[PDB]
Amino acid sequence: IQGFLKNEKDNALLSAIEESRKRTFGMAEEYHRESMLVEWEQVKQRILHTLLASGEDALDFTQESEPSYISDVGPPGRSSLDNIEMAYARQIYIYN
Amino acid sequence: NCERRRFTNLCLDAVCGYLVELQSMSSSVAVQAITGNFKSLQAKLERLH
Amino acid sequence: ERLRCHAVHVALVLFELKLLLKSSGQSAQLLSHEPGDPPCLRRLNFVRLLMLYTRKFESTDPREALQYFYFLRDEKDSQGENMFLRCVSELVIESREFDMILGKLENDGSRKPGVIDKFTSDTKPIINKVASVAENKGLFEEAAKLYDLAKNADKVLELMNKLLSPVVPQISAPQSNKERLKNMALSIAERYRAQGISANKFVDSTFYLLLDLITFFDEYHSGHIDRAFDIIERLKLVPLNQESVEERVAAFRNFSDEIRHNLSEVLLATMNILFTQFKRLKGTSPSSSSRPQRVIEDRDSQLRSQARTLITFAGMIPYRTSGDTNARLVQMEVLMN
Amino acid sequence: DPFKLAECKLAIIHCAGYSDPILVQTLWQDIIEKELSDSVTLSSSDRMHALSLKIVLLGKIYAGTPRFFPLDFIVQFLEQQVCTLNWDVGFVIQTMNEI
Amino acid sequence: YVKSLAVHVAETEGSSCTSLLEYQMLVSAWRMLLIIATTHADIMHLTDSVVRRQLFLDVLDGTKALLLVPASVNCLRLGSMKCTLLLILLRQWKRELGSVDEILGPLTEILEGVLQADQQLMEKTKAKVFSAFITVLQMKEMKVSDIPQYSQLVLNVCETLQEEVIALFDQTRHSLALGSATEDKDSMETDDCSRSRHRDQRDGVCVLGLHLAKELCEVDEDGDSWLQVTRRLPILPTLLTTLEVSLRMKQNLHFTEATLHLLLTLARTQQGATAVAGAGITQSICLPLLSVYQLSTNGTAQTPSASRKSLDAPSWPGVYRLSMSLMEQLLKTLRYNFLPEALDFVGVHQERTLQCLNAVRTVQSLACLEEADHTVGFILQLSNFMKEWHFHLPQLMRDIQVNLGYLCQACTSLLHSRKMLQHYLQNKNGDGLPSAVAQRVQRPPSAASAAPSSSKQPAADTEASEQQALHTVQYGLLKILSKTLAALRHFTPDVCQILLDQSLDLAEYNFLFALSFTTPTFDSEVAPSFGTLLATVNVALNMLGELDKKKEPLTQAVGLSTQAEGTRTLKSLLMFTMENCFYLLISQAMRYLRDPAVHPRDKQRMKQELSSELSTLLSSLSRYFRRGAPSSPATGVLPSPQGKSTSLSKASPESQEPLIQLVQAFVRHMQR
């Protein structure tokens, strides 16, 4: 009876820490698990927004040209309206 | 900064309670004025949410 | 590549002649089909045509990027925001040409027009849109300059108080962040006091108290010390008789956090002022100081009463001054006996 | 007790950890009705300010440990005093904001 | 009577109350009778829940009256004895105490009485009161509106925790100064005094305070209430400094795990995550955590005493899994504002990261699958930052790409070979017999005889337990495979880019799958392939193809809700496994079909083999989705007595899912 009245002080302390740790492991893993699936459906909805704007297989090719980045060697300074875009921009000034 | 949106509900619900109480009272100039004050408060809390 | 300029100018022609079919949302591809049009037509995302063309010169030739965005004067999105106001706000935020595009304040607080004053009869909504996007980019000096340019007067002080707050106690060195923000704040204060401007009074009073605290710290850093006493006795951020501790211990709860974060170093400065006046008294040898000795005994007691009044005050503030600031105060009074 | 130092009695039981709610409420009444007693020579605005300072001071200490700051009793008693004395309706609201 | 007698004792201390021993005897006997009247309630006839609720409330008030007298050693002793009864009655009656409101008030008053009294006497009462609060909060979903004086309860608990965690810190530092204790392994004697209290116990005030702080954090939806208390108390720095020593020493296991549980709960909110990061979390875990899984190089006896304990048992691998789950959760919430700290952490834990990607190849135990899923989880949060990760760790990112590849091969071959999965579980659920030596051959028979008795049956519960373990292991392998396929996708250019963008570089992106169409073997050195990806889709289709077979109407069981939700989450997981697999298959197929070194013969082979098996797979997908996947359009098509329009239509049909359109478009493009 003294062992049993020691044991029921053990079950009256021990057990709710497992119910608490089962709550952390469950409410952390379920939050990783459902985030990972909520992250997904917008991939499907973005495929719909892309493919329903191009249609069935009717526009693609970006056209083939050279890449550029934050690298390399560019001495020419910077103004970037060329002779033709400056002539056009001047005609838009003469419009506005 | 997060509490404020939990609290503006409780303010509107409590102001609705006090306006039900006030509108049961005998409609003296004080009860009329305070019914105006609490509806003037309501009509600011309706922008704090 | 070599043809984008013609494709834009043909689209501008088709747009003003109202031939161009427009795609009904910002995010769409450059071409689209729409859920109501005949299947052998298409629509153009006219905004996305321009924002993929102006972006060749948005950072170099922004004067004329603004001309291409002026075709969006009539245009709107699904929220009802105007696409000229949007694209010009995005343009100014990366081109940084604030003075030229949006105009400037000159030293009297008149507004000098920019290039944008060709395209609207009021620039204030656009200048506040750019000031708000600058504020959301942490560009708080530029947002404050733009809020004065629009005369959204409270929002200028709501940024200047935050900019001055971690800077008030710093040493006023040439070209420093203190000396820049000090002369910017004084330039705003002179405009406001000359034009009769006053704001939300908690922001307005914080702005002047941070300015006068810069005079307290600079007249302390100059070594002119007795001047910094002659300032802090007027500012009343601290008690100097024990009779006034409760007055300050209440008033601290009504000061703004820009003032609260400065108070520990204002206490260390005020205590070093007292501790230096104490050293000046005990140094003024009775071989030459032709006063009645009681007019030294006087102030060997006054400066202890003031020093203990600042320690009782520090022990009654419900905000964390540091263990170092509090130990420095006690160490100074242990050295003031 | 032999001198009725209620502002010290409250500090003794706060430091001793011991909180009887009946003693604690009694000590806040001994304090509030003494600050109301001894201020009787002054005007209502001055006595509002004195009772504000007294309770805004002691409310820095004991409002960290609610066992020694029975807010609900202090608010009811101060408003029953405002309601009696004809002080302003902003009073106890300001006293608790400034705590 | 045992209520009023305990009030009378609190009303008569300070007098020479002569009958106090007989009063203690009656209170002791009533405690004994009531603990037997819960456990033997059938024999005591104690089956009225109204009488049980009175017995609880009379023990609650009758404890409160004794614990509000902090100067009385007599009332503290009697009150700590009744608090032991209260806690047993609470846990055994946690279905009949049908209101919580009446219990929380007197428990706060009991806590505040227990915080006015001797710490060394009342340790063994602080624990009981925290254990009561945890048990009470666990009975009902509650908010910060529902707990009387919540902000003072969190203060009182955090202040108590700062007694306990400092006393644990210096207890763990004096064990660092007192070198060489012995293993004094015999002393069979009974219950005397003064042998020292280990503060790391599951019943310890420190450990119960951490779990109570967790249950209270799971009630403050914004964190604005708890963050006011942790601006008063330096409790995060104090916890991290004691965690740091505990991890270095392999000491304080219940505290170490309970601290990681509180931190993992805090990392769920933007305010708790920024408070945990701003407290230095990475410094106090990253180097200390190396100790935990490090083996000593002195080799001796493996001890096989790993008998059937719960997976919820506190353990040093569990501390590593929670550390990985915490860095998965901090990086998910803070992103760029915890990205250096996550790169320092993956660089230091690089060996264990590469071990845990591979442990699934050799140790198919559920606790290993639970370590691998958090390891791949942290990697799935980190591979969003591929260019930052490639700049800092350009070795380990390729080594993880390769080992995620072998993990994809291992999980798909195990999930495909359901017999080999049961066989690997059976060959690791039975123990003890060695022999060797080889040879061969021939034959029986017969015969005698006879008799007699007796009869037991084999239990069907054994086959049920094997099959439940098999379904849990298949769910673990499916989570790991799904996180693996999503993490591998970030190491490939998007299908929208490598189709449409023709000046897109291909040197930034590796070949992650070999050009084979062989079904994946469970085989150590067979690199993953397009045959592995085609097998992953067939595995998911077969599992989805069993979940709509188990639909016959069994009746008359009651109590389980969670199986309905697991039958949802397993199906949305099975979709996510197929859909990342199709993204990888299309992106890597375009990565082979563009590349100038890949031979024209086997580019042509690739256009042929995938054009066949994507057509057979899409013929099977288009045979499933015609039944409706779990969705609002399928729910709108489901009516028939009700909900019909035009003639026999309901809502609108024929929303095809975009996966089926994308895989069609890619198959049409390979057929040119």
PDB file of C-alpha atoms in Angstrom, chain A residues 1-2 4-37 39-41 43-48 50-52 54 56-57 59-67 69, chain E residues 31-32 35-36 39 84 87-88 91-92 94 127-128 131 134-135 138 191 202-203 208 211 214-215 218 257 261 264-265 268 310 312-314 322 325 328-329 332 475 479 483 489 499-503 569 572-573 576 579-580 583 657-658 661-662 668 672:
ATOM      1  CA  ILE A   1       0.000   0.000   0.000  1.00  0.00           C
ATOM      2  CA  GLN A   2       2.938   2.424   0.603  1.00  0.00           C
ATOM      3  CA  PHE A   4       0.994   1.914  -4.441  1.00  0.00           C
ATOM      4  CA  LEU A   5       0.622   5.348  -2.677  1.00  0.00           C
ATOM      5  CA  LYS A   6       4.195   6.212  -3.958  1.00  0.00           C
ATOM      6  CA  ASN A   7       3.279   5.012  -7.536  1.00  0.00           C
ATOM      7  CA  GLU A   8       0.021   7.081  -7.635  1.00  0.00           C
ATOM      8  CA  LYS A   9       2.115  10.169  -6.679  1.00  0.00           C
ATOM      9  CA  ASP A  10       4.348   9.153  -9.673  1.00  0.00           C
ATOM     10  CA  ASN A  11       1.377   8.753 -12.123  1.00  0.00           C
ATOM     11  CA  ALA A  12      -0.063  12.014 -10.638  1.00  0.00           C
ATOM     12  CA  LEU A  13       3.194  13.913 -11.572  1.00  0.00           C
ATOM     13  CA  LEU A  14       4.815  11.984 -14.538  1.00  0.00           C
ATOM     14  CA  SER A  15       1.893  11.487 -16.979  1.00  0.00           C
ATOM     15  CA  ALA A  16       0.803  15.066 -17.999  1.00  0.00           C
ATOM     16  CA  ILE A  17       4.450  15.817 -19.064  1.00  0.00           C
ATOM     17  CA  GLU A  18       4.013  13.108 -21.723  1.00  0.00           C
ATOM     18  CA  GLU A  19       0.636  14.667 -22.694  1.00  0.00           C
ATOM     19  CA  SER A  20       2.476  18.086 -22.862  1.00  0.00           C
ATOM     20  CA  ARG A  21       5.440  16.688 -24.929  1.00  0.00           C
ATOM     21  CA  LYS A  22       2.963  14.794 -27.203  1.00  0.00           C
ATOM     22  CA  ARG A  23       1.316  18.260 -27.665  1.00  0.00           C
ATOM     23  CA  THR A  24       4.710  19.863 -28.655  1.00  0.00           C
ATOM     24  CA  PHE A  25       5.782  17.051 -31.044  1.00  0.00           C
ATOM     25  CA  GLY A  26       2.244  16.869 -32.540  1.00  0.00           C
ATOM     26  CA  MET A  27       1.688  20.683 -32.820  1.00  0.00           C
ATOM     27  CA  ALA A  28       5.213  21.191 -34.296  1.00  0.00           C
ATOM     28  CA  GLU A  29       5.127  18.256 -36.799  1.00  0.00           C
ATOM     29  CA  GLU A  30       1.485  19.024 -37.842  1.00  0.00           C
ATOM     30  CA  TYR A  31       2.584  22.689 -38.406  1.00  0.00           C
ATOM     31  CA  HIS A  32       5.549  21.523 -40.587  1.00  0.00           C
ATOM     32  CA  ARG A  33       3.263  18.969 -42.359  1.00  0.00           C
ATOM     33  CA  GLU A  34       0.363  21.370 -43.132  1.00  0.00           C
ATOM     34  CA  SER A  35       2.685  24.306 -44.080  1.00  0.00           C
ATOM     35  CA  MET A  36       4.381  21.945 -46.622  1.00  0.00           C
ATOM     36  CA  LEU A  37       0.915  21.169 -48.187  1.00  0.00           C
ATOM     37  CA  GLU A  39       2.833  25.798 -49.853  1.00  0.00           C
ATOM     38  CA  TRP A  40       1.832  23.357 -52.661  1.00  0.00           C
ATOM     39  CA  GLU A  41      -1.663  24.332 -53.926  1.00  0.00           C
ATOM     40  CA  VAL A  43       2.062  25.920 -57.373  1.00  0.00           C
ATOM     41  CA  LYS A  44      -0.989  24.284 -59.092  1.00  0.00           C
ATOM     42  CA  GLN A  45      -2.916  27.613 -59.167  1.00  0.00           C
ATOM     43  CA  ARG A  46       0.202  29.361 -60.696  1.00  0.00           C
ATOM     44  CA  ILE A  47       0.374  26.630 -63.432  1.00  0.00           C
ATOM     45  CA  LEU A  48      -3.320  27.466 -64.188  1.00  0.00           C
ATOM     46  CA  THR A  50       0.381  30.662 -66.694  1.00  0.00           C
ATOM     47  CA  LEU A  51      -1.137  27.999 -69.033  1.00  0.00           C
ATOM     48  CA  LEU A  52      -4.593  29.703 -69.274  1.00  0.00           C
ATOM     49  CA  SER A  54      -0.614  31.348 -73.057  1.00  0.00           C
ATOM     50  CA  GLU A  56      -2.875  25.392 -75.525  1.00  0.00           C
ATOM     51  CA  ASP A  57       0.689  25.595 -76.937  1.00  0.00           C
ATOM     52  CA  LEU A  59       3.201  31.212 -77.517  1.00  0.00           C
ATOM     53  CA  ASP A  60       6.640  30.191 -76.106  1.00  0.00           C
ATOM     54  CA  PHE A  61      10.007  31.316 -77.601  1.00  0.00           C
ATOM     55  CA  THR A  62      11.544  34.263 -75.632  1.00  0.00           C
ATOM     56  CA  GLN A  63      13.976  34.609 -78.618  1.00  0.00           C
ATOM     57  CA  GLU A  64      17.671  33.630 -78.494  1.00  0.00           C
ATOM     58  CA  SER A  65      20.141  36.305 -77.177  1.00  0.00           C
ATOM     59  CA  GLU A  66      23.134  36.907 -74.842  1.00  0.00           C
ATOM     60  CA  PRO A  67      22.825  36.925 -70.969  1.00  0.00           C
ATOM     61  CA  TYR A  69      24.730  39.937 -64.793  1.00  0.00           C
TER      62      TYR A  69
ATOM     63  CA  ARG E  31      -6.585  10.782   1.977  1.00  0.00           C
ATOM     64  CA  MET E  32      -5.976   6.990   2.014  1.00  0.00           C
ATOM     65  CA  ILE E  35      -7.219   7.240  -3.333  1.00  0.00           C
ATOM     66  CA  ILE E  36      -8.673   3.709  -2.852  1.00  0.00           C
ATOM     67  CA  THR E  39      -9.037   3.001  -8.020  1.00  0.00           C
ATOM     68  CA  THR E  84      -1.026  15.131  -3.173  1.00  0.00           C
ATOM     69  CA  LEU E  87      -3.602  15.938  -7.887  1.00  0.00           C
ATOM     70  CA  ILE E  88      -4.629  12.202  -7.941  1.00  0.00           C
ATOM     71  CA  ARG E  91      -6.104  13.223 -13.046  1.00  0.00           C
ATOM     72  CA  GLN E  92      -8.422  10.237 -12.342  1.00  0.00           C
ATOM     73  CA  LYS E  94     -10.465  14.740 -15.662  1.00  0.00           C
ATOM     74  CA  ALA E 127       5.834  20.676  -8.362  1.00  0.00           C
ATOM     75  CA  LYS E 128       2.322  19.376  -7.359  1.00  0.00           C
ATOM     76  CA  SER E 131       1.387  19.504 -12.270  1.00  0.00           C
ATOM     77  CA  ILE E 134      -0.729  21.528 -16.581  1.00  0.00           C
ATOM     78  CA  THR E 135      -3.473  18.886 -16.018  1.00  0.00           C
ATOM     79  CA  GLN E 138      -4.912  20.066 -20.723  1.00  0.00           C
ATOM     80  CA  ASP E 191      13.782   6.267   2.707  1.00  0.00           C
ATOM     81  CA  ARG E 202      10.445  14.433 -14.488  1.00  0.00           C
ATOM     82  CA  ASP E 203       8.658  15.407 -11.195  1.00  0.00           C
ATOM     83  CA  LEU E 208       7.189  21.009 -14.420  1.00  0.00           C
ATOM     84  CA  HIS E 211       6.027  22.355 -19.279  1.00  0.00           C
ATOM     85  CA  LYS E 214       4.742  25.720 -22.651  1.00  0.00           C
ATOM     86  CA  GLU E 215       1.000  25.050 -21.945  1.00  0.00           C
ATOM     87  CA  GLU E 218       0.046  27.758 -26.333  1.00  0.00           C
ATOM     88  CA  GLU E 257      14.278  18.409 -23.670  1.00  0.00           C
ATOM     89  CA  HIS E 261      10.006  22.131 -26.230  1.00  0.00           C
ATOM     90  CA  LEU E 264      10.049  25.176 -30.315  1.00  0.00           C
ATOM     91  CA  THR E 265       6.613  26.485 -29.169  1.00  0.00           C
ATOM     92  CA  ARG E 268       5.866  29.427 -33.912  1.00  0.00           C
ATOM     93  CA  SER E 310       7.639   4.662 -25.534  1.00  0.00           C
ATOM     94  CA  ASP E 312       8.026   9.696 -26.112  1.00  0.00           C
ATOM     95  CA  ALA E 313      10.802   8.603 -23.655  1.00  0.00           C
ATOM     96  CA  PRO E 314      13.337  11.452 -22.947  1.00  0.00           C
ATOM     97  CA  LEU E 322      14.116  18.823 -31.340  1.00  0.00           C
ATOM     98  CA  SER E 325      12.923  20.900 -35.566  1.00  0.00           C
ATOM     99  CA  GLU E 328      13.529  24.166 -39.241  1.00  0.00           C
ATOM    100  CA  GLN E 329      10.970  26.358 -37.359  1.00  0.00           C
ATOM    101  CA  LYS E 332      10.739  29.076 -41.652  1.00  0.00           C
ATOM    102  CA  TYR E 475       3.867   7.057 -43.564  1.00  0.00           C
ATOM    103  CA  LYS E 479       6.991  12.106 -45.432  1.00  0.00           C
ATOM    104  CA  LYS E 483      10.335  16.498 -48.241  1.00  0.00           C
ATOM    105  CA  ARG E 489      13.280  20.494 -56.756  1.00  0.00           C
ATOM    106  CA  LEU E 499      10.875  25.174 -71.064  1.00  0.00           C
ATOM    107  CA  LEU E 500      10.480  28.868 -72.115  1.00  0.00           C
ATOM    108  CA  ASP E 501      13.820  30.623 -71.342  1.00  0.00           C
ATOM    109  CA  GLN E 502      16.416  29.605 -73.964  1.00  0.00           C
ATOM    110  CA  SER E 503      19.395  31.716 -72.648  1.00  0.00           C
ATOM    111  CA  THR E 569      -3.436  14.396 -44.652  1.00  0.00           C
ATOM    112  CA  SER E 572      -2.769  15.478 -49.751  1.00  0.00           C
ATOM    113  CA  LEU E 573       0.751  14.131 -48.943  1.00  0.00           C
ATOM    114  CA  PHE E 576       2.525  16.379 -53.060  1.00  0.00           C
ATOM    115  CA  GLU E 579       3.654  16.527 -58.007  1.00  0.00           C
ATOM    116  CA  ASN E 580       7.258  17.320 -56.902  1.00  0.00           C
ATOM    117  CA  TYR E 583       8.439  18.742 -61.520  1.00  0.00           C
ATOM    118  CA  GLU E 657      -6.068  19.482 -62.457  1.00  0.00           C
ATOM    119  CA  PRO E 658      -3.091  21.497 -63.898  1.00  0.00           C
ATOM    120  CA  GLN E 661      -2.314  19.623 -68.359  1.00  0.00           C
ATOM    121  CA  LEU E 662       1.451  20.232 -67.734  1.00  0.00           C
ATOM    122  CA  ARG E 668       3.143  16.532 -76.725  1.00  0.00           C
ATOM    123  CA  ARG E 672       7.765  16.428 -81.931  1.00  0.00           C
TER     124      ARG E 672
END
